[PDB]
Structures are given as structure tokens and as C-alpha cells.
Symmetry: D2
Subunit: 124 residues, 4 copies
């Protein structure tokens, strides 16, 4: 049996990689945070669902984003209940964007993994 605090620091270690990969615009750094089964979704400018396989995120990070030395992320919330967790991350100044991200995570074989990311892109 583990404490809230122990699981929190394990989850922050995983989400840390996401935040670092985002800021460095290097998908290699964030890839280990995600299950192979993970999905990414948001809504586009026409209010339509956009996304799919997590590789789509790695593609945008690698091909579209630029390294963002001034990006600043806040892990606003981590809710943890047994093998399940949700997290909110807010990021300013990441490749010209401000985001709020919501993550669903599960503790698989002793290690926390992201199975779903969704986001909202804040107006510029």
C-alpha cells in the first residue's frame, strides 16, 4: 500500500517528461509518458473533433512546434484513486500557444501511464 504523496510524486515524474518534451519540442522525451494505446483529442476552429492516435501529438511536437525556453507549466491538479488518476496541466508560451490539458492516467504494471490527453487552446 502507498500514500497519496508517493503516487503524486510518481505521477509528476511522468508528467514532467510531457512538460519537458513540449518545451524542448522533442517527442522522444515525452513518448515514455504515454501508453501505446493513448489518444489525443481537441476541437478545431470549426468546433469539430480533431485528433486520434497519440503519434499525432508526437508529429505536431516534432514537426510544428519550436523549442520554447520561456514556456511555463503548472500541474494544477492530480486526482488519484487507486490505479486511476486524472491530472490538469496549464502551460503558457509554448510555441506561441497557451493550453489547458486534461490527462487520464492508469498505474500499469507498477508505473503510471497516460492513456488520454485532451486540450483546450486559449485565445491568443
Amino acid at each position: 500500500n502507498t500514500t497519496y504523496v508517493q503516487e503524486y510524486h510518481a505521477i509528476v515524474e511522468v508528467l514532467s517528461k510531457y512538460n519537458e518534451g513540449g518545451k524542448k519540442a522533442d517527442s522522444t522525451i515525452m513518448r515514455p509518458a504515454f501508453s501505446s494505446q493513448a489518444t489525443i483529442f481537441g476541437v478545431d476552429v470549426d468546433n469539430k473533433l480533431t485528433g486520434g492516435p497519440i503519434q499525432g501529438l508526437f508529429d505536431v511536437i516534432d514537426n510544428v512546434f519550436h523549442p520554447s525556453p520561456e514556456a511555463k507549466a503548472a500541474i494544477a491538479r492530480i486526482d488519484i484513486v487507486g490505479t486511476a488518476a486524472s491530472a490538469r496541466i496549464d502551460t503558457d508560451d509554448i510555441s506561441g500557444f497557451r493550453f489547458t490539458d486534461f490527462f487520464n492516467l492508469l498505474k500499469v504494471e507498477g508505473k503510471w501511464t497516460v492513456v488520454s490527453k485532451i486540450y483546450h487552446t486559449h485565445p491568443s
Copy 2:
């Protein structure tokens, strides 16, 4: 031009269908709440990732669960930022189970929809 209260009530209308569909053991009632691209994941007794396409949830509701008039659900939290939302739902005495569910939702073409559900099954 929506308030938090307005969006909250919209999301509760969606999440209500999930709660109702589970208590009635009727996938037809909950189906409208989910995007076709939604996934469901949890961790099995061997700590392995279990789940996939949301159709798997509907199959379990239709083929494993039975109507549970004593089922009690609590929408513990809804976090809403623009087009994205996270929710936590705890359910007691649903076909012999106790769950904590975390949901990722997006407001697609003016309507909230679930793109990911994860869960933890509580013991005993």
C-alpha cells in the same frame, strides 16, 4: 458567452445518460454520451492495461450487468476550461461493483461528448 454553471449543467445532462445507462444495464441509453472514437481503460488483476474501443463498455453493460435500482452515483467533480472538461464519477452498488471513473470530455459542434473513460474498481 457561456457561464461555468451553464456548461456544468450541459455536461451533467451528458454524464446522466452514462449513470442512467449503467443503472438500467442498457447501453442504448449511454451510447449518445460518447464519441465513436472514445476509449475505455482500466487495470486488470495482473495490473495489466485492459480495455480499448468504447464498444467494449457497451458490451459489458449489455451482456454482464443487470438493472441495479440501488446503484448510487456522485458526480464528484467537473473541471471545465473552454471546450475541454474533466469529470470524476463515483458509483456504489452497480451490478455488485464500486467504481471511481474519470472522464475526458470535449464540446464538439456545441455538444459535450466523452472521448475517454478510465476507472478504478474498489475491492470487496
Copy 3:
């Protein structure tokens, strides 16, 4: 021992009295939700702390507010850890205002009670 859903239901019964008292502009309906020790605080137009004993809330409700049949409240979040809990309530169209409220509650002699409310008043 009690479940999350059970404690959630108990807290909502308490917070419901608060929402009804506000909507009816009748402090007697809400009074039972608050400890005799409870306080209220927010920030005034000059960014200064304003409030003190919870009776200051009851005085505003009774002397300043009017019944607001179109008021709509959302209990956005209730976090529960043993004997302690936090809640967020958003309310639209209560006597011309829109608020976000945060509550700290404790389970005292078997019963949930508010010991602190704070609030943010949104633009009209």
C-alpha cells in the same frame, strides 16, 4: 465505515441548504449548514480583505439580497478526505450577481458543517 458516495450525498444535503437560502434570500434556510465558528471572506472593490463572522453572510442575504427564482447553482467539486472536505459552488443570477464560492467543511459529531466560505464576485 462510509463511502465517498455516502459522504458526498451528506455534504450535498448541507450545501443544498446554502443554495436554497441564497435563492430564496432567507438566511434561516442556510444557517444550519454553518458552524457557529464559521467565517466568510472575499476581497472588496479596493482589493482589501472583507468579512469576518458568518453572520455577515446572513445579514447580506436578509437585508440586501432579493429572492432570485432564476438563480442557478452548480456544485462544481467536492473533495472528501476523512473528516475534512472542500467544495466549490458556482451561482448565476442571484440578486444580480454571479459568484464562485469555496467551502471548507468538517465532519463534526457525525455531521458535515461549513467552517469557512470564501468567494469571488464575477463581473455583471
Copy 4:
């Protein structure tokens, strides 16, 4: 004109003092984090309300607690709405105790301040 990330970091700076004063068992470190009108409450072993002015907290920190090098705190959640915020902090191994704390904060004259803390003490 401030972002969530900006307010989050301002609030963490304040809550850091609380976690630091606690770990070092030095109330002078934590004192700036609390309004002069702040309260602290929990429930005692008889399930009765216990606490009052925040000076009571400082007394326990100085007279009961000893420096706890093993102490680990997690800022589990910070909800921020305008001039109001709530926070949850979980702490392991602090002078022999495990706590979950809930904070109400207000942004008073440009600076975040705690007006209420409540806590649950976890079993041994």
C-alpha cells in the same frame, strides 16, 4: 490580465512557506502565508470541532513539532477563480503525522493569503 500559470506559481510560493515552516518546525517561516484573521480547524479524537485562531497552529509547530527531514508534501490541487482559490496539500512523515490539508486563499492587495485551513489527520 493574469494567467492561471502565473497565479498558480504565486500561490505555490505562499504554500511553500507553510510546507517549509512545517518541515523545519519553525512557525516564523510559515507566518507570512496566513492572514492575521486566518483560522485553523480539525476534528479531535471525540469527533468534536477543534481549533480557532491561526496562532494555535504556530504554537503546535513550535512547541510540539520537531524538524522532520523525512517530510514530504504534495500540493495535490489549486483551484483558482479570480481573487479566490482553494488548495489541497498532503504531507507524509511530519513530526510523526500524515495530514491532508484544505486551504481557502484570497488575493488581497495583489498578494495571495490563507484565510482558512482545515485538516484531516490520517491513522498510524
